[PDB]
């Protein structure tokens, strides 16, 4: 079934934070990428099993993280990338406020 915007909206109204995350992830989309901690993109050549990580063109075989995002988001990011836009994903802050 489509859990629509209107449907999301009520869950937001209830404050059912985890419930919404579960509908949008666990019970749909839900995917795992490996992102680079320097150029915050899906670049990582994660040969998990061999435990090799790497991001050639960062030369980063160390500073790497795994994230759980909707596959559609993985997709959106790859689509924006193909259109020259870099949606750099970062696992820490800098701005504060």
């Amino acid at each position: 079934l489509r859990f629509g915007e209107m449907e999301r909206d009520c869950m937001i109204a209830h404050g059912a934070a985890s419930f919404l995350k579960e509908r949008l992830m666990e019970a749909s989309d839900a995917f795992r990428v490996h992102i680079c901690g320097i150029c915050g993109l899906m670049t990582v050549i994660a040969k998990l099993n061999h435990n090799q990580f790497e991001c050639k063109g960062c030369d980063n075989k160390i500073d790497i993280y795994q994230i759980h995002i909707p596959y559609a988001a993985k997709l959106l990011f790859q689509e924006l990338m193909a259109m020259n836009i870099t949606p750099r994903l970062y696992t820490d802050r800098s701005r504060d406020f």
Binding site: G15, A17, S18, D96
Partner: protein
């Protein structure tokens, strides 16, 4: 930067959401064969076990209440009033 216990201002009562999240979290923990801090009086459902732990105030969790600036007040489930 974390507000000291003797400088806290947030409600001394537990929010509807705090209670729900506490009961959820404990149930999810108890369910994963976590140790129970109460006498199960024949109890088998983890939500009911959590309700019981919440009633005896034997839940070892702390609610970190963030203020819009980023600062926060830590509150024990033991110290929060449950008028809900």
């Amino acid at each position: 930067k974390a507000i000291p216990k003797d400088q806290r201002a947030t409600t001394p009562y537990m929010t509807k959401y705090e209670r729900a999240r506490i009961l959820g979290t404990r149930a999810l923990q108890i369910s994963m064969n976590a140790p129970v801090f109460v006498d199960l009086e024949g109890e088998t459902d983890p939500l009911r076990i959590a309700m019981k732990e919440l009633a005896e105030k034997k839940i070892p969790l702390v609610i970190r209440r963030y203020l819009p600036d980023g600062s926060f007040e830590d509150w024990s489930v033991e110290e929060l009033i449950v008028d809900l």
